[PDB]
Amino acid sequence: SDEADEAYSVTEQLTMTGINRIRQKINAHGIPVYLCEACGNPIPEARRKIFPGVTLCVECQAYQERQRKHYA
Amino acid sequence: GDDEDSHLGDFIEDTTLELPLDSATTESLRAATHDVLAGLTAREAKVLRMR
Amino acid sequence: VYSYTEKKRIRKDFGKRPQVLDVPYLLSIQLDSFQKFIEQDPEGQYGLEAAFRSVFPIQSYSGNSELQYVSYRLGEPVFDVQECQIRGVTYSAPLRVKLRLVIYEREAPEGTVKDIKEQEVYMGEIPLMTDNGTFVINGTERVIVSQLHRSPGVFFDSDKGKTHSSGKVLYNARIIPYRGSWLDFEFDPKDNLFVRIDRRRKLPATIILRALNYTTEQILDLFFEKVIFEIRDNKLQMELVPERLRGETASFDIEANGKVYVEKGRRITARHIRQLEKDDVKLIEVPVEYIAGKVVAKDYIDESTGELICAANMELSLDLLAKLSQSGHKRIETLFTNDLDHGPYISETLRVDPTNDRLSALVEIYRMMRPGEPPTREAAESLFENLFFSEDRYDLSAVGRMKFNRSLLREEIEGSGILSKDDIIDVMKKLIDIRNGKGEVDDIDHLGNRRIRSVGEMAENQFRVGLVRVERAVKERLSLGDLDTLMPQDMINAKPISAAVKEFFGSSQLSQFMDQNNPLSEITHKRRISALGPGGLTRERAGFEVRDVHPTHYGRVCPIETPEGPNIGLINSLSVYAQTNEYGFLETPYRKVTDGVVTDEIHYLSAIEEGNYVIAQANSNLDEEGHFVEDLVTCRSKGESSLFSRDQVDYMDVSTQQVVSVGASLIPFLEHDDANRALMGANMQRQAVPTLRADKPLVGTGMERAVAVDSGVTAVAKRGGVVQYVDASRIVIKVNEDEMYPGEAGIDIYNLTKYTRSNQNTCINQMPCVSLGEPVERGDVLADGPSTDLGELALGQNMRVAFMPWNGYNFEDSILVSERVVQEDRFTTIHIQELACVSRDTKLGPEEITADIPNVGEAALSKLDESGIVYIGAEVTGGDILVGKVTPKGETQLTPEEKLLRAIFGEKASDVKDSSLRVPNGVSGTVIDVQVFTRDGVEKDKRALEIEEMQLKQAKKDLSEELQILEAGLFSRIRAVLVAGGVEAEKLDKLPRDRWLELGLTDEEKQNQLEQLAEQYDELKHEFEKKLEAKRRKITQGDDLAPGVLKIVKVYLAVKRRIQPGDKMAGRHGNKGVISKINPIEDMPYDENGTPVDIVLNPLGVPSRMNIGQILETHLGMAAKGIGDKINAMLKQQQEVAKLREFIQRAYDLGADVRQKVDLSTFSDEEVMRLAENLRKGMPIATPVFDGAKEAEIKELLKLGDLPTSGQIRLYDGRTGEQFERPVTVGYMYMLKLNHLVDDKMHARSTGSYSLVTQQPLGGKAQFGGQRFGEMEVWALEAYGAAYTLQEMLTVKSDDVNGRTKMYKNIVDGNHQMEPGMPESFNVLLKEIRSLGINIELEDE
Amino acid sequence: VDYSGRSVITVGPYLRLHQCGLPKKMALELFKPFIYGKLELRGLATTIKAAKKMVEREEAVVWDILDEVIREHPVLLNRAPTLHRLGIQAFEPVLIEGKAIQLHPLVCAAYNADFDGDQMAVHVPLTLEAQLEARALMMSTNNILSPANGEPIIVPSQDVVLGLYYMTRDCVNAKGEGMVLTGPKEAERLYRSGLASLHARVKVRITEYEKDANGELVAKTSLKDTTVGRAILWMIVPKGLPYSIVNQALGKKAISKMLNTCYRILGLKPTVIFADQIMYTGFAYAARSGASVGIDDMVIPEKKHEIISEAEAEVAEIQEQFQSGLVTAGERYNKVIDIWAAANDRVSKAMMDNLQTETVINRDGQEEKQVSFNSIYMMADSGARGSAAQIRQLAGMRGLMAKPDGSIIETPITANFREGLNVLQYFISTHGARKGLADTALK
Ligand SMILES: [Mg+2]
Ligand SMILES: [Zn+2]
């Protein structure tokens, strides 16, 4: 087959695996947590209602995301 | 480097060889002259061979 | 408001935007760069003056022997361009320099000079640039592709991930100069910070700080912020800076005023910091444990003893707080460390610092640069100062300083040359801050780190290397320097620099053959960026990083034109409006934006200056005054793109085309194609061979005219005037009265270039298009080149396609071309092959070029003349002779019975061996032109004398036609003398022109004027006597051939290849194809009206490869031919000018907003008939690329004709005569003709020549040798049980040099046996193993 | 290797899958030695030199001599990357005008050769074991089963599948509706004469031969409620198969299991002859379908605008909740890409549901909906070329292009190829596209 057909298959592979990773991240299933998995603060309503079942307050989330921004 | 990957010795053709048409002609003519000397006598064929 | 030339056929132009930046002269890169290179440039900047001011003046070993620079010159060539393609010289230009050898007196530093011998010395021949940026090095037109390499400056790289297996990324920072020692910073996974000078050993990175006069106090106050603790009468108070506490553990009660605003254990969220800010806490009383891990900056010692309490950068434990308590300190300095943001790095690296202070650090640097050298005070000082602080031994170029100040967020873009304390410390701060979270890393591909060279700067560097290798010799010959006996040319050698510069221009990974097989190919080859070459990264070292596209390509390098396959992305093709900047980085236009207006001032942006702005998007409808139509518009700010408010944009794209190249901006309806497909489309449009009658893009993209004109092929008018005499060779423009210089007006003349070879073996023709007695405006085309037509780039031909399967003849991508396309000879492409027949000089004697040949009667010698060269015109075919050539071959060495045979018939065995230049087996042509070069040691034969006489007649004719014009200009100036002061009007046209010199005139300044102009006349006379003398002498001389050759005879066959199953073809959108059965006319489909659809492509290729652009192009084409046939009916049924005007006007307005309204009420009645006759084949249509014609416009433009709006007609099969169910699509698609011709590719070899080291097949002629029966094929045959075929595949057919001849004897004698033997390759292997001391033998049993 | 050649290839469906074309000139230059021998044997030229001059003049009798020595003399066609052991196969030659080594269409999938200019190299077997191996080890009709699995590698590829799929389908009210026929034969006499359209449900009397009688074939006739397409095709099926092999709508998977059943039940000879016959009749009825593609075929859902409106509304809501400090930047990024992927799937499913069932037509009564005859749809459904994803890109929105690193960019292409693309969307597409080429060209 042609040389662009194979490149289309690889692009499908690449974007599909990326998107399905990032959908695997977001939870969308409730496990009501009511305060952090680290700090203990109450998780406000709006945050727990957007992302159901989210273990961490906002600050703890930003902080872990920033320690992980340097990739561990 | 202009090709798959060559060295200039890989292109220097040959000139000692004989074109295999020549080999076939020489053999075919050996056979034909053999027959033509079959068309002579002992004195005839032997003298023309040895000549 | 059009010209009289532009009205030949006025391309219907969709495209809604107004163009505000007309297309730049597409070859700006090559021309402007080589212009900066070669010119006396009264300033030290770039050019040759740069190299000469760099390497000169040469001072000897202080001995008052100096050789300095004055100025240089570029003598005009000896052979001009076309002469230099005929003969084979390098179109050079001899150089000259005014070197000035000065010698000072001994007993004199600068005492009185004793000699200044000033003499001009030759060196090298820099090959000048043609008008088209294409040098001529050895007869062939070569082009030097611009390079793209890392700009000297600073770079902050990651090398993320894989190392150390923890995932933790490192953040290294390199300071690359133009010339000098590097400097690198890097983190270890243990997170201490290390340095390294040029790629040598690591070091505790604080050592270089200390080496720069830094002790620990000021280090810690540079790389850290302070937090003071206070002991105010009870237990360890602390300063409270409020924002110090975001994202941190609260290991204590944060009370204030005896009130609790934050409590222990928790985390200090933004709520807490907000409330502390509102509640005004400044000095919190925390326990000792929290100081227990802090770090102390300043030094502390017992003030009563002077004994060292705590060194700088030690961790305060409770005991040390106590110890300094009793010393009387209430201030305490502590580093504001933190795991998130203000991380401990320099402190812990001081932990790693083995050394203690400055001198030790300099010692360690001296011991890391070079081992074994014992350290020393002054040795250390010298070495460290001479790494980064020596104007002589280290210099960032000014480009270096500019990047180094723009990558630090500095102020001045230009400045010093060497580093400093502040440059190093800013590098380190930027590095630590990269690792702290704020800031990010510059990936490699970012065009802020790819400075673009070109011909100019690369040739300048090669001349630089030449100058250094010659100044070695200059200083050496000055070693022995006699003061006044060696003039300033025996110190130098000319051939060195010529060797270097020729090696560059003729042997480079850049200086490569022009892809001159289609005007788009040249002008997409000279616009080219390459990342390979000497000084760039090649494939192996790097690497996947640079293949990628990066969002700083938007208008600086084409994303949808790059050579697919082995090296993608390393051959980025430069954008349409891109340019090289002052420093070098690619830059592009942008329209400036005021408060809320879109100004029309275009303003250039490089790569590093863009992200700090916020650029709009060209696809933004703006409201007739320069205000946007909304308050929020799509933009792109820093890589990302998004909606912005109206009062925030700063820059709008110049035009919707600027994201692309001249390659992919010619694909109409590019906007609907998967980017891979536009890639393959442009990369198959660069290869279309110029057909016989190059027609036009029936559906174009606006840029096609600019590509045809700006490339060199079209014959563009230099000055507007009337046309006096057209002809198949020359065009004679009579310049007007206003475009005409004051003295010696004359008339412009263009000698076109008739049939002639290009590098790819095609026909670079030029045909006039402006007929006799016809105006032409300045800047207009006179003569179309190959594949241009009316000055509109026409690569292939338009023709009728119908998408439908049609019996598997178009199975995968195959194509089914009705014979109405090949009868017309419309893809019939002309290929002009060159065959040479040299005549060499062997030890036995000189080869003959006689017509007397053995073993060939008059039969093959009917086409030969009296001298062995063929006539100009004989239609040679496969296997005939073009040049009869015989080599003396002594020692016939008769054999057995062959000798008997010669006795039988007495036929004298000849002493001569036939070796005549016979046509390659297969071509079939017309010998259009025979040239005979001769070593000037041989008596030129009879035919070469015919050729000399003929060329000399031609040159005499030409130079005499030139003299006529010149003397007419001088007679004009004479009249301009008489016209003022006593002209006698009609007493000057009657008498002969030659007797105007003796015209009466009073002896004023005007009589002396007549005398002076007579002097000019006689000067012209003698000038052209001697110039025709020089022309006759260039022709008459011998040539200067290669060593040992008598005479070469070139013979230019001119084949005409038609079309035949195998010839690749392709649209523009990337639908390849291999025309597969050249069907009759009857068989083809035919719409209800009768016309058979010429091509028949395949429907299964539009959905699977999402290039729906070809269906939209087919529909726009069908509508176009609808308009065409309507005009054809209105013209054949001949109506009038009136109906034609109303109808063409209906076609040119057509609905939606456009920028093309023409108003034919200004076309005279007789121009509209010419306009119709140029439209009667079909109304062209423009469609700017990302701004094309949306579907509904096409549907209405169909309804203006009479086609069905669906686009799909109902077709009747041609064989059975019964309607195809489900109507097909038919239309006029423009199809190229790629030159992967079949008869170039076909090949077959039964018994050819053979190699010399291993008796394998090797042929040459078209690799006249077997296909490589490689290894994977051997795996294949072993997979089957077949082993006999393998054994003969590499014992009988290939190597065993008795096996093959016995196989041939058997084949002729009808006995398909084989007698293998053993391969000669393995026998070579036995010998090569055995030459080594390895006794390999074969047991025999 | 002496005795070889190579050239650009082409299609030529008029062949049987055990024989390839071979140009006259390439034939005469491969088989020079055998030709010389044949000439001096038949006495048409005295000695080998004269035979050389004769074939170098291309006289009249050399062509007849070559047509004799090319009668049963198999050659070996090969391609450049010979991945697996089918990269080399024998064929008998068929002498051709021109310069293209014409290749049988079913053989492509084995060679993995498309006809867009990929060159094939012909070797010629010399010895007599070599010819016997080309005939009984490497002939094309003795490699139908891939060595990597017993299933056939003679699966019809693209035009033939569209041919069969358009031949054996059914609309609801065409000509000759519900009439009765007495065999496949008068179904053919119907269709080729213009009384009943190619696919219109009919009753026929087919006669399927089951063979439970061990190697014996028990006849059995019936009245299948089938179409005119199916009964016209059933003539090409051999005796062995049962009639339910074709009574369905013949995609590509089903058509390959047709051949697989025929091979398992009857063997190799009838399955070769049946591969040839399916290919021929598929090509003919596809060329008769007129199945063209066109720009009116790609029916955007009118509901796409609402889906994208709501998608951008939810993204703006996440935006507001990001400025309010209620979700970190990572979580807003993932919420955005989530709601866009949801919108992508919704638009895809809505377009496919407007594209497949769109044919609502009327049988002798009110109306009915049925699987569409939409050219782009059949080319995506039967299995000729493409599938739901590529159609999704021509009608629905086109996904989210993802830059090469992996971090899929969050500015989704809200447009598609039928509509245009503005410059941002295209310049984003370039990232993923050039990445795709740069990998499958290093591959
Ligand atoms: Mg291919
Ligand atoms: Zn928390």
Residue numbers in the entry:
A (entry chain M): 2 to 73
B (entry chain L): 512 to 562
C (entry chain I): 2 to 1342
D (entry chain J): 347 to 789
Please share excerpts from the published article on this structure:
Analysis of the cryo-EM data for the TraR-Eσ70 complex gave rise to three distinct conformational classes. The second class [TraR-Eσ70(II)] contained approximately 33% of the particles and resolved to a nominal resolution of 3.8 Å. In TraR-Eσ70(I) and TraR-Eσ70(II), Si3 is in two distinct positions with respect to the RNAP, while in TraR-Eσ70(III) Si3 is disordered. Si3 in the TraR-Eσ70(II) structure [Si3(II)] is rotated 121° such that SBHMa interacts with the β’jaw and SBHMb interacts with TraRG, a disposition of Si3 that, to our knowledge, has not been observed previously. Deletion of Si3 had little to no effect on TraR-mediated inhibition of rrnB P1 and rpsT P2 but transcription by ΔSi3-RNAP was activated only ~50% compared with WT-RNAP on three different TraR-activated promoters (pthrABC, Figure 3E; pargI, Figure 3—figure supplement 1B; phisG, Figure 3—figure supplement 1C). Three TraRG residues (TraR-E46, R49, and K50) are central to the Si3-TraRG interface. However, these same variants exhibited at least ~2 fold reduced activation at the thrABC promoter even at saturating TraR concentrations, indicating a role for the TraR-Si3 interaction in the mechanism of activation. The combination of the TraR-Si3 interface and the ΔSi3-RNAP mutants was epistatic; the same ~2 fold reduction in activation was observed as with the Si3-TraR interface mutants or the ΔSi3-RNAP mutant individually. These results indicate that the Si3(SBHMb)-TraRG interaction enabled by the Si3(II) conformation accounts for part of the TraR-mediated effect on activation.
In Escherichia coli (Eco), the essential primary σ factor, σ70, binds to RNAP to form the σ70-holoenzyme (Eσ70) that is capable of recognizing and initiating at promoters for most genes. Upon locating the promoter, Eσ70 melts a ~ 13 bp segment of DNA to form the open promoter complex (RPo) in which the DNA template strand (t-strand) is loaded into the RNAP active site, exposing the transcription start site. Although only half the length of DksA, TraR regulates Eco transcription by binding to the RNAP secondary channel and mimicking the combined effects of ppGpp and DksA. To help understand TraR regulation and principles of the regulation of transcription initiation in general, we used single particle cryo-electron microscopy (cryo-EM) to examine structures of Eσ70 alone, Eσ70 bound to TraR (TraR-Eσ70), and Eσ70 bound to a promoter inhibited by TraR [rpsT P2; Gopalkrishnan et al., 2017].
